[PDB]
Design a protein around this ligand. Structure first.
Ligand SMILES: O=S(=O)(O)Oc1c[nH]c2ccccc12
Ligand SMILES: O=S(=O)(O)Oc1c[nH]c2ccccc12
Length: 557
């Protein structure tokens, strides 16, 4: 009984949380109550299997088991049309179909949170359901949220209430903590969405290269065979979480935190504070631990990778390992480079070897490969410098607007909401990274940009309208950012005419949150640029201002 095993390892509480998260991520439109019923029903079943490891159907894979309870509510086609086609399928296909149906932009009501009092009463009255509702709401809106970590957020959510409700000014104590949480949860969801996209659209080999680079940067002292071990386990974890095998992912993720803390000494002298913590805070702390100090006596890379004469042979013998070693070595000594840049470099090296080791004067051919790296390293450098400069002088809002204009002109066909969100996110990269000194700017900026452009790529892939987005999103995971940066203006784009129905003006615009005014004016700016692609940085201000001024007078007259 697979359930039995997982049950013993996670216990009842966490086991019940993971199953709810998994159902909420599969049937996103399904009501809360309905889910809870299925969960209990499944939990008890696991309980009867905990005793007689051969009852009714305890010798069934989780997929088989969960794929059945869901098909006892999804059958209702009038409710989840396509979902049903899935249940008519067999296994393991029955599972794939569901995964093909996860919705990155579920049409749902924005979670409005009542006054502090209503919440505190609800929390105090019944803690388990309050907590469960949170898990369900987050899970259905982010069908790829890293389950293990969602458990950690739930703990932080509980602790927020546990204290604010008891204190003097609850309002001022709760909101801040929940703001902090709403943001961090969106961030977390976006990063994980990139990991699943990597695994699902490009293959585990791409995910593995991403982890080697990232871990080597974080554990410069660790040994390649060690990093490689960590990378292999980490791959399985995410492979499972992304595929919906939430129980094993959580279970497997515990082991990794276990393993890493035991071997603390030979990995990083920074895990200390992480390892003397509870399970969930442990997993979490390790994932975000800062880079260790770089081993002081590290020989030039040129030695073993360009000057040596055994390059082609070692390459020939096992290119994967040799390429992995190149990345690990280059990465460990460049915590100042972004993970994607290191991957582009590793890609340039592999490409240079493929050609060079074919000619009969190898060493001479691949002798100046590091000169091919210079251009690749300064492009991101210039990009960041130029954009952080702009950011400093304009501030977040004005910067987001400049980006809205930039991107609408690049890919005008993209839906106004996606453009607005993506561009605001791109603007937050300016706020999060330009702060840092040049040494920490690139990993901050470019890896954050990869996360944000990944959103654009999954939102657009649902309803493709720009072959230019499609091309930049599917050609290569690592060159996405450079691909988008290179686009200027779509010259074949035919402008849109007018339509007052395109942008209603319901007076409810002097009543909405300040933040929501901006999002309205930005939604207007995008529509404006779509009508006048050729308009200019001069006239665009003229129509935005007057437009702002317009809503000013109007609102107070
Ligand atoms: O700032 S980063 O550390 O680069 O953010 C991260 C990206 N991918 C990650 C996987 C595990 C832990 C942290 C991660
Ligand atoms: O090619 S872009 O997407 O315009 O590059 C960028 C968008 N937002 C950024 C913030 C900081 C540095 C570079 C940025």
């Amino acid at each position: 009984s697979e359930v039995a095993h997982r049950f013993k390892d996670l216990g009842e509480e966490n086991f019940k949380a993971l199953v709810l998260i998994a159902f909420a991520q599969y049937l996103q439109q399904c009501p809360f109550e309905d889910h809870v019923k299925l969960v209990n029903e499944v939990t008890e079943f696991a309980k009867t299997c905990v005793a007689d490891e051969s009852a009714e159907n305890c010798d069934k894979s989780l997929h088989t088991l969960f794929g059945d309870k869901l098909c006892t509510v999804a059958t209702l086609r009038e409710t989840y049309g396509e979902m049903a086609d899935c249940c008519a399928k067999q296994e393991p296909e029955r599972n794939e179909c569901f995964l093909q149906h996860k919705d990155d932009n579920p049409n749902l009501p924005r979670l409005v949170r009542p006054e502090v009092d209503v919440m505190c009463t609800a929390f105090h009255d019944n803690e388990e359901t309050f907590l469960k509702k949170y898990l369900y709401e987050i899970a259905r809106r982010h069908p790829y949220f890293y389950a293990p970590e969602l458990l950690f957020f739930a703990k932080r959510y509980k602790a927020a209430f546990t204290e604010c409700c008891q204190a003097a000014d609850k309002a001022a104590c709760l909101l801040p903590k929940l703001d902090e949480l709403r943001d961090e949860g969106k961030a977390s969801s976006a990063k994980q969405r990139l990991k699943c996209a990597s695994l699902q659209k490009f293959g585990e080999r791409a995910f593995k290269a991403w982890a080697v680079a990232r871990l080597s940067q974080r554990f410069p002292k660790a040994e390649f065979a060690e990093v490689s071990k960590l990378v292999t386990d980490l791959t399985k974890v995410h492979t499972e979480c992304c595929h919906g095998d939430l129980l094993e992912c959580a279970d497997d993720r515990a082991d990794l935190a276990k393993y890493i803390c035991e071997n603390q000494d030979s990995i990083s002298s920074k895990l200390k504070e992480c390892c003397e913590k509870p399970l969930l805070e442990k997993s979490h702390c390790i994932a975000e631990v800062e880079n260790d100090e770089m081993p002081a006596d590290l020989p030039s890379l040129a030695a073993d990778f360009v000057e040596s004469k055994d390059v082609c042979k070692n390459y020939a013998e096992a290119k994967d390992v040799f390429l992995g070693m190149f990345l690990y070595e280059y990465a460990r000594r460049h915590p100042d480079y972004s993970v994607v840049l290191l991957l582009r470099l590793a890609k340039t090296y592999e490409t240079t070897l493929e050609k060079c080791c074919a000619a009969a004067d190898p060493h001479e051919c691949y002798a100046k490969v590091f000169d091919e790296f210079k251009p690749l390293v300064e492009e991101p450098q210039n990009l960041i410098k130029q954009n952080c400069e702009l950011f400093e002088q304009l501030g977040e809002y004005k910067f987001q607007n400049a980006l809205l204009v930039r991107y609408t002109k690049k890919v005008p066909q993209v839906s106004t909401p996606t453009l607005v969100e993506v561009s605001r996110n791109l603007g937050k990269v300016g706020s999060k990274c330009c702060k840092h000194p040049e040494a920490k700017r690139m990993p901050c900026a470019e890896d954050y940009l990869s996360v944000v452009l990944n959103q654009l790529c999954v939102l657009h892939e649902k309803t493709p309208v720009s072959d230019r987005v499609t091309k930049c999103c599917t050609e290569s995971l690592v060159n996405r950012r450079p691909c988008f940066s290179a686009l200027e203006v779509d010259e074949t784009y035919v402008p849109k005419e007018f339509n007052a129905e395109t942008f209603t003006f319901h007076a409810d615009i002097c009543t909405l949150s300040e933040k929501e005014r901006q999002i309205k004016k930005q939604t207007a700016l995008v529509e404006l640029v779509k009508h006048k692609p050729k308009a200019t940085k001069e006239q665009l201000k003229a129509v935005m201002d007057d437009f702002a001024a317009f809503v000013e007078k109007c609102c107070k007259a």
